[PDB]
């Protein structure tokens, strides 16, 4: 993505304060709670019967760490997301059968999680920068769909 130098530093600076594993579990759990149809891929995870069950499920938390860890690594390649996520795009399409709309939902849930975590430090301009990143990653993951 095309972020101004200012935008890149705002992203990087907040990210440095993130507990990846924690936010990962929170974002994934909140996606499954707020948009329940997303639970369709996770029937092997066990009990997703209530918000509490979802947020507390160790399988959800483990998957959230895996997803955000990859996300986290992509922040180093802001300039080459398509390339960085190409293989994962292919995997998500050909083997996993994940509708790319799920990537967009996760990106909005991630922005709400950061807002909740950071409060006032998540200013309108810092949000805008993260919006570009989350759209960029969603696009990069949807790129190889066919």
């Amino acid at each position: 993505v095309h972020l101004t130098p200012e935008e890149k530093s705002a992203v990087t600076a907040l990210w440095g304060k993130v507990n990846v594993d924690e936010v990962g579990g929170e974002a994934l759990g909140r996606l499954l709670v707020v948009y329940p149809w997303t639970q369709r891929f996770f029937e092997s995870f066990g009990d997703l019967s209530t918000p509490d069950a979802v947020m507390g499920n160790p399988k959800v938390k483990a998957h959230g760490k895996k997803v955000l860890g990859a996300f986290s690594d992509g922040l180093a390649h802001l300039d080459n997301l398509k390339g960085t996520f190409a293989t994962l795009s292919e995997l998500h399409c050909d083997k996993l059968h994940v509708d790319p709309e799920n990537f967009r939902l996760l990106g909005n849930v991630l922005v709400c999680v950061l807002a909740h975590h950071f409060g006032k430090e998540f200013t309108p301009p810092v949000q805008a920068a993260y919006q570009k990143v989350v759209a960029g990653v969603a696009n990069a993951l949807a790129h190889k769909y066919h």
Partner: protein, 141 residues
Amino acid sequence: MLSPADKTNVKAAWGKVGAHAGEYGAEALERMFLSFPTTKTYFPHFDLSHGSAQVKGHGKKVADALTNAVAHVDDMPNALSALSDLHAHKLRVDPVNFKLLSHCLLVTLAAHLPAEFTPAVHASLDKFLASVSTVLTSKYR
């Protein structure tokens, strides 16, 4: 909000579909898979090739549901209750996809009903498919 003229327009257009409803349903699906490839993610278990009997079979199921909706245009929520439960709780198709199929159904109708696809009828059909879509996704959350 389907006005009496919208209802009239839909019953008329659907009337003319008649017996071809199943062939039009299959064609709509084919247009959808080709134009919006992300929709293929919900049918990993189907042969999506042109002429596929699985697509033809599914097309008839979809068209029949629409026929039932037209017949019960005043009581759609009850008529499609079982299909709303199905989509919300088992299939779990992202709501965004309903707009893509609706578009493809419109294109199919256009291509087959030259005379009947007037601007007024096109508007009524779009409103009707949006109503069906709303009903189908009403129990998602």
